[PDB]
Amino acid sequence: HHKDEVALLATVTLVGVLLQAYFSLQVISARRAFHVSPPLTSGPPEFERVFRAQVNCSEYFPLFLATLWVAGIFFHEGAAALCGLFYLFARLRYFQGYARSAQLRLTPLYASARALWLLVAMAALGLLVHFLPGTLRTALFRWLQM
Amino acid sequence: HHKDEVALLATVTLVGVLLQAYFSLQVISARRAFHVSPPLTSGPPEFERVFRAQVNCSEYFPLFLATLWVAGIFFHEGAAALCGLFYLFARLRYFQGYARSAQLRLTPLYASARALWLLVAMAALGLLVHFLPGTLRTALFRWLQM
Amino acid sequence: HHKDEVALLATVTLVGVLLQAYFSLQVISARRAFHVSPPLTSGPPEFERVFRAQVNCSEYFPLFLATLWVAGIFFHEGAAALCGLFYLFARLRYFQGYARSAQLRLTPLYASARALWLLVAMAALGLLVHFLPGTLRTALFRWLQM
Ligand SMILES: N[C@@H](CCC(=O)N[C@@H](CS)C(=O)NCC(=O)O)C(=O)O
Ligand SMILES: N[C@@H](CCC(=O)N[C@@H](CS)C(=O)NCC(=O)O)C(=O)O
Ligand SMILES: N[C@@H](CCC(=O)N[C@@H](CS)C(=O)NCC(=O)O)C(=O)O
Ligand code: NI
């Protein structure tokens, strides 16, 4: 069982899945409430905003997962998991904002981006540590001989 | 080689990839058959249904992968892999249905959702086992002293 | 630290994330330059091409990641990481092409597909090795007795 060091990342991943499923069900009820039957992704602006919120989130979702894992494995699991929650939480506000007003989406989008960029930075710092000693070591072997 | 305990999850993942690529090629031929040249995602309803089937699947695809892995790692690899196949198979019927009729998409969608929700439940049960003993143990440490 | 055998896959994954974020920022500036304010995903053809490039890439992105990991784990990490870069690089040209001309997207798309199909083949070959000995062995146990 090599699970222990990874269960926080996996559980935030699962919260992310539930959240995405939440958005998807919301599109189904807005699909019914405004008579917009499949296919067709157009209708009144209330519907379109809800469609687009869902689509937007589901497009950043893999970015989120990728960096969440790389940051959690290469930097620190708990911090990664923590930005993970901010991110997910900001994205819940993004969706709820977007639905009432397109302008009211902007505040939680900006919060979602900070969290997400933090994961990226952590990931980048994590990989730098892994890789940079090994390669500075041998860059210094050029200069021998000597 | 820590591959052994994970190869079923990886191979279902690969079936999922081939399946998504299958859908994508189908959109290319429907793009040609109805003269709908990039960009533009609109045309006759036969084309639109095929475009939307592909888009729908490719939106649930990461959810699928995430839960497939978490369920396979934290609950049981073979069962996860098994819902994985039902899911993938249901999604193949979803796509083939949607293309002929939008109503004929509904039966395999409902099957895809059951499989997918099963993976989620398995994942949730898996994480509960990992986390809940550790935390009940120490919740019981509050009540000592004693 | 079981990081060492996986850091190349993780770092290409991170390049992929930065690249996707690059595309997303490009859509934001084309959204401003042609006054196409959220929601609405339609406008002049310059804008639509840029929207679609981003969407296209972000749809293949999970396929890419999945096969990149399975190929890197089950076949060989460095080769997988190498197709990974070709793929990512081809996808950068795809996006830059698509934006100026829809026809000028085709050359880097074709390069992105070769790289991606190579990862799939490598993955398929990797899983074959894992699975096929174990099962030929026991297929040969049918024919004993003997
Ligand atoms: N992206 C989906 C989100 C919700 C969903 O899963 N809808 C199901 C059931 S109504 C569907 O099959 N939608 C058809 C489609 O994606 O065009 C949508 O636009 O409807
Ligand atoms: N989502 C894609 C699925 C198939 C695909 O990969 N098409 C390629 C070659 S025709 C493409 O570059 N499509 C342009 C686009 O996505 O707008 C589509 O709508 O065409
Ligand atoms: N798919 C996005 C890519 C770029 C993006 O992230 N845009 C942000 C800020 S303008 C957004 O909230 N777009 C609203 C939407 O996706 O409809 C888009 O179409 O705009
Ligand atoms: Ni280990």
Side-chain angles (χ1 to χ4, degrees), chain C residues 36-67:
Chain C
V36 185
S37 75
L40 258 133
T41 55
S42 59
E46 259 86 20
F47 171 73
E48 295 203 350
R49 292 197 304 274
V50 177
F51 176 69
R52 298 293 326 166
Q54 180 259 297
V55 161
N56 202 268
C57 295
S58 86
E59 203 175 50
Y60 282 85
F61 189 62
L63 274 43
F64 169 59
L65 288 183
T67 88

PDB file of all heavy atoms in Angstrom, chain C residues 36-67:
ATOM      1  N   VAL C  36     -15.610  40.730 -28.617  1.00  0.00           N
ATOM      2  CA  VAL C  36     -16.492  39.577 -28.423  1.00  0.00           C
ATOM      3  C   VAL C  36     -16.610  39.226 -26.939  1.00  0.00           C
ATOM      4  O   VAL C  36     -15.853  38.406 -26.429  1.00  0.00           O
ATOM      5  CB  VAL C  36     -16.010  38.330 -29.208  1.00  0.00           C
ATOM      6  CG1 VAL C  36     -17.030  37.183 -29.074  1.00  0.00           C
ATOM      7  CG2 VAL C  36     -15.761  38.665 -30.688  1.00  0.00           C
ATOM      8  N   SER C  37     -17.560  39.836 -26.241  1.00  0.00           N
ATOM      9  CA  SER C  37     -17.597  39.695 -24.785  1.00  0.00           C
ATOM     10  C   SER C  37     -18.458  38.511 -24.310  1.00  0.00           C
ATOM     11  O   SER C  37     -19.544  38.278 -24.845  1.00  0.00           O
ATOM     12  CB  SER C  37     -18.016  41.011 -24.111  1.00  0.00           C
ATOM     13  OG  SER C  37     -19.403  41.238 -24.257  1.00  0.00           O
ATOM     14  N   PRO C  38     -17.959  37.759 -23.305  1.00  0.00           N
ATOM     15  CA  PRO C  38     -18.631  36.581 -22.730  1.00  0.00           C
ATOM     16  C   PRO C  38     -20.108  36.827 -22.337  1.00  0.00           C
ATOM     17  O   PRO C  38     -20.398  37.864 -21.746  1.00  0.00           O
ATOM     18  CB  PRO C  38     -17.752  36.218 -21.530  1.00  0.00           C
ATOM     19  CG  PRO C  38     -16.396  36.737 -21.900  1.00  0.00           C
ATOM     20  CD  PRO C  38     -16.648  38.005 -22.674  1.00  0.00           C
ATOM     21  N   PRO C  39     -21.026  35.888 -22.669  1.00  0.00           N
ATOM     22  CA  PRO C  39     -20.752  34.619 -23.376  1.00  0.00           C
ATOM     23  C   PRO C  39     -20.475  34.858 -24.862  1.00  0.00           C
ATOM     24  O   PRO C  39     -19.564  35.616 -25.160  1.00  0.00           O
ATOM     25  CB  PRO C  39     -22.023  33.788 -23.145  1.00  0.00           C
ATOM     26  CG  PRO C  39     -23.106  34.793 -22.857  1.00  0.00           C
ATOM     27  CD  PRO C  39     -22.443  36.018 -22.271  1.00  0.00           C
ATOM     28  N   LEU C  40     -21.215  34.255 -25.778  1.00  0.00           N
ATOM     29  CA  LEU C  40     -20.924  34.460 -27.205  1.00  0.00           C
ATOM     30  C   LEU C  40     -19.551  33.890 -27.567  1.00  0.00           C
ATOM     31  O   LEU C  40     -18.521  34.323 -27.051  1.00  0.00           O
ATOM     32  CB  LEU C  40     -20.981  35.950 -27.604  1.00  0.00           C
ATOM     33  CG  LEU C  40     -22.166  36.576 -28.342  1.00  0.00           C
ATOM     34  CD1 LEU C  40     -22.551  37.881 -27.654  1.00  0.00           C
ATOM     35  CD2 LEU C  40     -21.812  36.829 -29.815  1.00  0.00           C
ATOM     36  N   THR C  41     -19.545  32.914 -28.467  1.00  0.00           N
ATOM     37  CA  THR C  41     -18.300  32.331 -28.950  1.00  0.00           C
ATOM     38  C   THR C  41     -18.167  32.551 -30.468  1.00  0.00           C
ATOM     39  O   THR C  41     -17.429  31.842 -31.156  1.00  0.00           O
ATOM     40  CB  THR C  41     -18.192  30.837 -28.558  1.00  0.00           C
ATOM     41  OG1 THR C  41     -19.343  30.121 -29.027  1.00  0.00           O
ATOM     42  CG2 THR C  41     -18.112  30.692 -27.043  1.00  0.00           C
ATOM     43  N   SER C  42     -18.883  33.556 -30.968  1.00  0.00           N
ATOM     44  CA  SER C  42     -18.904  33.877 -32.391  1.00  0.00           C
ATOM     45  C   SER C  42     -18.470  35.309 -32.659  1.00  0.00           C
ATOM     46  O   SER C  42     -18.674  36.195 -31.833  1.00  0.00           O
ATOM     47  CB  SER C  42     -20.304  33.663 -32.952  1.00  0.00           C
ATOM     48  OG  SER C  42     -21.239  34.484 -32.275  1.00  0.00           O
ATOM     49  N   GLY C  43     -17.878  35.528 -33.825  1.00  0.00           N
ATOM     50  CA  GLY C  43     -17.465  36.860 -34.235  1.00  0.00           C
ATOM     51  C   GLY C  43     -16.891  36.824 -35.636  1.00  0.00           C
ATOM     52  O   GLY C  43     -17.257  35.966 -36.439  1.00  0.00           O
ATOM     53  N   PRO C  44     -15.982  37.760 -35.935  1.00  0.00           N
ATOM     54  CA  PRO C  44     -15.205  37.717 -37.182  1.00  0.00           C
ATOM     55  C   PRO C  44     -14.400  36.408 -37.255  1.00  0.00           C
ATOM     56  O   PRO C  44     -14.135  35.825 -36.200  1.00  0.00           O
ATOM     57  CB  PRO C  44     -14.268  38.925 -37.045  1.00  0.00           C
ATOM     58  CG  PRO C  44     -14.221  39.206 -35.556  1.00  0.00           C
ATOM     59  CD  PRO C  44     -15.574  38.863 -35.048  1.00  0.00           C
ATOM     60  N   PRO C  45     -14.028  35.948 -38.470  1.00  0.00           N
ATOM     61  CA  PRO C  45     -13.317  34.667 -38.627  1.00  0.00           C
ATOM     62  C   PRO C  45     -11.945  34.624 -37.955  1.00  0.00           C
ATOM     63  O   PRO C  45     -11.514  33.541 -37.579  1.00  0.00           O
ATOM     64  CB  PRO C  45     -13.159  34.532 -40.147  1.00  0.00           C
ATOM     65  CG  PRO C  45     -14.265  35.337 -40.700  1.00  0.00           C
ATOM     66  CD  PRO C  45     -14.390  36.521 -39.775  1.00  0.00           C
ATOM     67  N   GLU C  46     -11.266  35.763 -37.821  1.00  0.00           N
ATOM     68  CA  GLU C  46      -9.993  35.796 -37.103  1.00  0.00           C
ATOM     69  C   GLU C  46     -10.207  35.317 -35.668  1.00  0.00           C
ATOM     70  O   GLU C  46      -9.474  34.454 -35.184  1.00  0.00           O
ATOM     71  CB  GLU C  46      -9.355  37.195 -37.123  1.00  0.00           C
ATOM     72  CG  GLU C  46      -8.212  37.386 -38.146  1.00  0.00           C
ATOM     73  CD  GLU C  46      -8.693  37.776 -39.553  1.00  0.00           C
ATOM     74  OE1 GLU C  46      -9.836  38.277 -39.689  1.00  0.00           O
ATOM     75  OE2 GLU C  46      -7.918  37.577 -40.521  1.00  0.00           O
ATOM     76  N   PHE C  47     -11.226  35.855 -34.999  1.00  0.00           N
ATOM     77  CA  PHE C  47     -11.543  35.433 -33.639  1.00  0.00           C
ATOM     78  C   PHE C  47     -11.944  33.958 -33.558  1.00  0.00           C
ATOM     79  O   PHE C  47     -11.433  33.215 -32.696  1.00  0.00           O
ATOM     80  CB  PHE C  47     -12.657  36.275 -33.015  1.00  0.00           C
ATOM     81  CG  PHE C  47     -13.156  35.721 -31.702  1.00  0.00           C
ATOM     82  CD1 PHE C  47     -12.376  35.818 -30.550  1.00  0.00           C
ATOM     83  CD2 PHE C  47     -14.381  35.074 -31.622  1.00  0.00           C
ATOM     84  CE1 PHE C  47     -12.816  35.292 -29.335  1.00  0.00           C
ATOM     85  CE2 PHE C  47     -14.829  34.548 -30.415  1.00  0.00           C
ATOM     86  CZ  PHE C  47     -14.039  34.657 -29.266  1.00  0.00           C
ATOM     87  N   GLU C  48     -12.868  33.542 -34.426  1.00  0.00           N
ATOM     88  CA  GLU C  48     -13.361  32.175 -34.388  1.00  0.00           C
ATOM     89  C   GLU C  48     -12.257  31.147 -34.556  1.00  0.00           C
ATOM     90  O   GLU C  48     -12.211  30.161 -33.816  1.00  0.00           O
ATOM     91  CB  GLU C  48     -14.460  31.958 -35.407  1.00  0.00           C
ATOM     92  CG  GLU C  48     -15.684  32.776 -35.083  1.00  0.00           C
ATOM     93  CD  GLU C  48     -16.939  32.205 -35.692  1.00  0.00           C
ATOM     94  OE1 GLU C  48     -16.817  31.278 -36.530  1.00  0.00           O
ATOM     95  OE2 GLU C  48     -18.040  32.683 -35.322  1.00  0.00           O
ATOM     96  N   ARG C  49     -11.361  31.381 -35.509  1.00  0.00           N
ATOM     97  CA  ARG C  49     -10.207  30.502 -35.678  1.00  0.00           C
ATOM     98  C   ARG C  49      -9.377  30.362 -34.395  1.00  0.00           C
ATOM     99  O   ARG C  49      -8.991  29.255 -34.019  1.00  0.00           O
ATOM    100  CB  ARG C  49      -9.332  30.983 -36.837  1.00  0.00           C
ATOM    101  CG  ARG C  49      -9.982  30.837 -38.199  1.00  0.00           C
ATOM    102  CD  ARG C  49      -8.930  30.934 -39.268  1.00  0.00           C
ATOM    103  NE  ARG C  49      -8.186  32.182 -39.153  1.00  0.00           N
ATOM    104  CZ  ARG C  49      -8.575  33.324 -39.710  1.00  0.00           C
ATOM    105  NH1 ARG C  49      -9.708  33.359 -40.415  1.00  0.00           N
ATOM    106  NH2 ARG C  49      -7.837  34.418 -39.557  1.00  0.00           N
ATOM    107  N   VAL C  50      -9.120  31.477 -33.715  1.00  0.00           N
ATOM    108  CA  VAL C  50      -8.381  31.448 -32.448  1.00  0.00           C
ATOM    109  C   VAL C  50      -9.137  30.719 -31.323  1.00  0.00           C
ATOM    110  O   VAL C  50      -8.537  29.944 -30.582  1.00  0.00           O
ATOM    111  CB  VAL C  50      -7.977  32.863 -31.970  1.00  0.00           C
ATOM    112  CG1 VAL C  50      -7.273  32.794 -30.595  1.00  0.00           C
ATOM    113  CG2 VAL C  50      -7.081  33.516 -32.984  1.00  0.00           C
ATOM    114  N   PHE C  51     -10.441  30.978 -31.197  1.00  0.00           N
ATOM    115  CA  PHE C  51     -11.292  30.237 -30.273  1.00  0.00           C
ATOM    116  C   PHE C  51     -11.187  28.732 -30.542  1.00  0.00           C
ATOM    117  O   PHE C  51     -11.029  27.933 -29.598  1.00  0.00           O
ATOM    118  CB  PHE C  51     -12.760  30.707 -30.368  1.00  0.00           C
ATOM    119  CG  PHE C  51     -13.720  29.913 -29.514  1.00  0.00           C
ATOM    120  CD1 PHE C  51     -13.678  30.002 -28.119  1.00  0.00           C
ATOM    121  CD2 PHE C  51     -14.667  29.074 -30.104  1.00  0.00           C
ATOM    122  CE1 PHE C  51     -14.565  29.268 -27.326  1.00  0.00           C
ATOM    123  CE2 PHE C  51     -15.564  28.335 -29.315  1.00  0.00           C
ATOM    124  CZ  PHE C  51     -15.519  28.432 -27.928  1.00  0.00           C
ATOM    125  N   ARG C  52     -11.238  28.344 -31.817  1.00  0.00           N
ATOM    126  CA  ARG C  52     -11.324  26.926 -32.164  1.00  0.00           C
ATOM    127  C   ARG C  52      -9.995  26.222 -32.010  1.00  0.00           C
ATOM    128  O   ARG C  52      -9.951  25.034 -31.664  1.00  0.00           O
ATOM    129  CB  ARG C  52     -11.852  26.725 -33.581  1.00  0.00           C
ATOM    130  CG  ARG C  52     -13.251  27.257 -33.811  1.00  0.00           C
ATOM    131  CD  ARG C  52     -14.312  26.490 -33.043  1.00  0.00           C
ATOM    132  NE  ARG C  52     -13.992  25.073 -32.932  1.00  0.00           N
ATOM    133  CZ  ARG C  52     -14.604  24.235 -32.099  1.00  0.00           C
ATOM    134  NH1 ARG C  52     -15.585  24.673 -31.316  1.00  0.00           N
ATOM    135  NH2 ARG C  52     -14.238  22.956 -32.055  1.00  0.00           N
ATOM    136  N   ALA C  53      -8.915  26.946 -32.277  1.00  0.00           N
ATOM    137  CA  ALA C  53      -7.594  26.375 -32.060  1.00  0.00           C
ATOM    138  C   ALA C  53      -7.476  25.950 -30.603  1.00  0.00           C
ATOM    139  O   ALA C  53      -7.146  24.801 -30.307  1.00  0.00           O
ATOM    140  CB  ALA C  53      -6.515  27.377 -32.419  1.00  0.00           C
ATOM    141  N   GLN C  54      -7.792  26.882 -29.701  1.00  0.00           N
ATOM    142  CA  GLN C  54      -7.725  26.665 -28.252  1.00  0.00           C
ATOM    143  C   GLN C  54      -8.575  25.484 -27.816  1.00  0.00           C
ATOM    144  O   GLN C  54      -8.109  24.615 -27.039  1.00  0.00           O
ATOM    145  CB  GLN C  54      -8.199  27.914 -27.523  1.00  0.00           C
ATOM    146  CG  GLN C  54      -8.168  27.822 -26.009  1.00  0.00           C
ATOM    147  CD  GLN C  54      -9.549  27.553 -25.418  1.00  0.00           C
ATOM    148  OE1 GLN C  54     -10.477  28.372 -25.556  1.00  0.00           O
ATOM    149  NE2 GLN C  54      -9.688  26.405 -24.735  1.00  0.00           N
ATOM    150  N   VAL C  55      -9.814  25.463 -28.320  1.00  0.00           N
ATOM    151  CA  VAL C  55     -10.766  24.403 -27.998  1.00  0.00           C
ATOM    152  C   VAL C  55     -10.280  23.048 -28.481  1.00  0.00           C
ATOM    153  O   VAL C  55     -10.413  22.028 -27.762  1.00  0.00           O
ATOM    154  CB  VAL C  55     -12.157  24.658 -28.622  1.00  0.00           C
ATOM    155  CG1 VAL C  55     -12.964  23.358 -28.670  1.00  0.00           C
ATOM    156  CG2 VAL C  55     -12.906  25.731 -27.864  1.00  0.00           C
ATOM    157  N   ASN C  56      -9.707  23.042 -29.686  1.00  0.00           N
ATOM    158  CA  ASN C  56      -9.253  21.802 -30.279  1.00  0.00           C
ATOM    159  C   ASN C  56      -8.153  21.224 -29.411  1.00  0.00           C
ATOM    160  O   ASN C  56      -8.242  20.088 -28.947  1.00  0.00           O
ATOM    161  CB  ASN C  56      -8.783  22.005 -31.718  1.00  0.00           C
ATOM    162  CG  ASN C  56      -8.810  20.710 -32.529  1.00  0.00           C
ATOM    163  OD1 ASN C  56      -7.815  19.974 -32.609  1.00  0.00           O
ATOM    164  ND2 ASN C  56      -9.962  20.425 -33.127  1.00  0.00           N
ATOM    165  N   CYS C  57      -7.144  22.042 -29.140  1.00  0.00           N
ATOM    166  CA  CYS C  57      -6.006  21.621 -28.324  1.00  0.00           C
ATOM    167  C   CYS C  57      -6.412  21.115 -26.958  1.00  0.00           C
ATOM    168  O   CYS C  57      -5.836  20.167 -26.433  1.00  0.00           O
ATOM    169  CB  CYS C  57      -5.030  22.783 -28.158  1.00  0.00           C
ATOM    170  SG  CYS C  57      -4.268  23.290 -29.729  1.00  0.00           S
ATOM    171  N   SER C  58      -7.424  21.746 -26.383  1.00  0.00           N
ATOM    172  CA  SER C  58      -7.743  21.479 -25.009  1.00  0.00           C
ATOM    173  C   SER C  58      -8.602  20.210 -24.902  1.00  0.00           C
ATOM    174  O   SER C  58      -8.846  19.666 -23.819  1.00  0.00           O
ATOM    175  CB  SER C  58      -8.391  22.713 -24.390  1.00  0.00           C
ATOM    176  OG  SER C  58      -9.760  22.688 -24.633  1.00  0.00           O
ATOM    177  N   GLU C  59      -9.000  19.720 -26.063  1.00  0.00           N
ATOM    178  CA  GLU C  59      -9.793  18.511 -26.210  1.00  0.00           C
ATOM    179  C   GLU C  59      -8.848  17.320 -26.404  1.00  0.00           C
ATOM    180  O   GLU C  59      -9.126  16.215 -25.948  1.00  0.00           O
ATOM    181  CB  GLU C  59     -10.568  18.701 -27.477  1.00  0.00           C
ATOM    182  CG  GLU C  59     -11.799  17.920 -27.638  1.00  0.00           C
ATOM    183  CD  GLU C  59     -12.475  18.349 -28.908  1.00  0.00           C
ATOM    184  OE1 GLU C  59     -11.769  18.397 -29.946  1.00  0.00           O
ATOM    185  OE2 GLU C  59     -13.677  18.690 -28.854  1.00  0.00           O
ATOM    186  N   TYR C  60      -7.718  17.542 -27.078  1.00  0.00           N
ATOM    187  CA  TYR C  60      -6.759  16.459 -27.242  1.00  0.00           C
ATOM    188  C   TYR C  60      -5.814  16.380 -26.073  1.00  0.00           C
ATOM    189  O   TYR C  60      -5.101  15.388 -25.886  1.00  0.00           O
ATOM    190  CB  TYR C  60      -5.980  16.602 -28.543  1.00  0.00           C
ATOM    191  CG  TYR C  60      -6.782  16.151 -29.737  1.00  0.00           C
ATOM    192  CD1 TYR C  60      -7.664  17.018 -30.375  1.00  0.00           C
ATOM    193  CD2 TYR C  60      -6.667  14.854 -30.224  1.00  0.00           C
ATOM    194  CE1 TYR C  60      -8.396  16.615 -31.467  1.00  0.00           C
ATOM    195  CE2 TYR C  60      -7.407  14.433 -31.318  1.00  0.00           C
ATOM    196  CZ  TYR C  60      -8.267  15.320 -31.934  1.00  0.00           C
ATOM    197  OH  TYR C  60      -9.004  14.918 -33.025  1.00  0.00           O
ATOM    198  N   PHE C  61      -5.812  17.430 -25.271  1.00  0.00           N
ATOM    199  CA  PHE C  61      -4.855  17.511 -24.175  1.00  0.00           C
ATOM    200  C   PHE C  61      -4.883  16.322 -23.190  1.00  0.00           C
ATOM    201  O   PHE C  61      -3.823  15.803 -22.842  1.00  0.00           O
ATOM    202  CB  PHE C  61      -4.966  18.853 -23.446  1.00  0.00           C
ATOM    203  CG  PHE C  61      -3.884  19.074 -22.477  1.00  0.00           C
ATOM    204  CD1 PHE C  61      -2.554  19.132 -22.917  1.00  0.00           C
ATOM    205  CD2 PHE C  61      -4.161  19.196 -21.117  1.00  0.00           C
ATOM    206  CE1 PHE C  61      -1.511  19.327 -22.021  1.00  0.00           C
ATOM    207  CE2 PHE C  61      -3.108  19.378 -20.184  1.00  0.00           C
ATOM    208  CZ  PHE C  61      -1.791  19.447 -20.645  1.00  0.00           C
ATOM    209  N   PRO C  62      -6.080  15.895 -22.733  1.00  0.00           N
ATOM    210  CA  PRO C  62      -6.166  14.686 -21.902  1.00  0.00           C
ATOM    211  C   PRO C  62      -5.757  13.397 -22.616  1.00  0.00           C
ATOM    212  O   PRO C  62      -5.217  12.489 -21.981  1.00  0.00           O
ATOM    213  CB  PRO C  62      -7.657  14.606 -21.551  1.00  0.00           C
ATOM    214  CG  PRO C  62      -8.143  16.015 -21.633  1.00  0.00           C
ATOM    215  CD  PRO C  62      -7.372  16.617 -22.772  1.00  0.00           C
ATOM    216  N   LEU C  63      -6.037  13.289 -23.909  1.00  0.00           N
ATOM    217  CA  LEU C  63      -5.612  12.112 -24.648  1.00  0.00           C
ATOM    218  C   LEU C  63      -4.101  12.074 -24.565  1.00  0.00           C
ATOM    219  O   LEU C  63      -3.502  11.087 -24.125  1.00  0.00           O
ATOM    220  CB  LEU C  63      -6.024  12.207 -26.106  1.00  0.00           C
ATOM    221  CG  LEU C  63      -7.436  11.712 -26.430  1.00  0.00           C
ATOM    222  CD1 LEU C  63      -8.482  12.167 -25.425  1.00  0.00           C
ATOM    223  CD2 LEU C  63      -7.793  12.204 -27.812  1.00  0.00           C
ATOM    224  N   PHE C  64      -3.497  13.174 -24.989  1.00  0.00           N
ATOM    225  CA  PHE C  64      -2.068  13.360 -24.857  1.00  0.00           C
ATOM    226  C   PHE C  64      -1.496  12.935 -23.509  1.00  0.00           C
ATOM    227  O   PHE C  64      -0.577  12.126 -23.459  1.00  0.00           O
ATOM    228  CB  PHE C  64      -1.739  14.823 -25.079  1.00  0.00           C
ATOM    229  CG  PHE C  64      -0.351  15.161 -24.708  1.00  0.00           C
ATOM    230  CD1 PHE C  64       0.717  14.517 -25.336  1.00  0.00           C
ATOM    231  CD2 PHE C  64      -0.094  16.108 -23.739  1.00  0.00           C
ATOM    232  CE1 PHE C  64       2.024  14.839 -25.015  1.00  0.00           C
ATOM    233  CE2 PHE C  64       1.207  16.430 -23.400  1.00  0.00           C
ATOM    234  CZ  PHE C  64       2.268  15.790 -24.040  1.00  0.00           C
ATOM    235  N   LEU C  65      -2.025  13.487 -22.421  1.00  0.00           N
ATOM    236  CA  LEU C  65      -1.545  13.140 -21.082  1.00  0.00           C
ATOM    237  C   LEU C  65      -1.677  11.663 -20.758  1.00  0.00           C
ATOM    238  O   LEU C  65      -0.720  11.028 -20.300  1.00  0.00           O
ATOM    239  CB  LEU C  65      -2.317  13.903 -20.019  1.00  0.00           C
ATOM    240  CG  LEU C  65      -1.985  15.381 -19.966  1.00  0.00           C
ATOM    241  CD1 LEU C  65      -2.752  16.014 -18.821  1.00  0.00           C
ATOM    242  CD2 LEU C  65      -0.466  15.558 -19.829  1.00  0.00           C
ATOM    243  N   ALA C  66      -2.881  11.130 -20.925  1.00  0.00           N
ATOM    244  CA  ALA C  66      -3.081   9.708 -20.708  1.00  0.00           C
ATOM    245  C   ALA C  66      -2.024   8.847 -21.430  1.00  0.00           C
ATOM    246  O   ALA C  66      -1.378   7.998 -20.799  1.00  0.00           O
ATOM    247  CB  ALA C  66      -4.483   9.299 -21.106  1.00  0.00           C
ATOM    248  N   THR C  67      -1.807   9.082 -22.723  1.00  0.00           N
ATOM    249  CA  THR C  67      -0.982   8.149 -23.468  1.00  0.00           C
ATOM    250  C   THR C  67       0.455   8.440 -23.135  1.00  0.00           C
ATOM    251  O   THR C  67       1.296   7.557 -23.192  1.00  0.00           O
ATOM    252  CB  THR C  67      -1.182   8.204 -25.012  1.00  0.00           C
ATOM    253  OG1 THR C  67      -0.315   9.192 -25.569  1.00  0.00           O
ATOM    254  CG2 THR C  67      -2.615   8.515 -25.382  1.00  0.00           C
TER     255      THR C  67
END
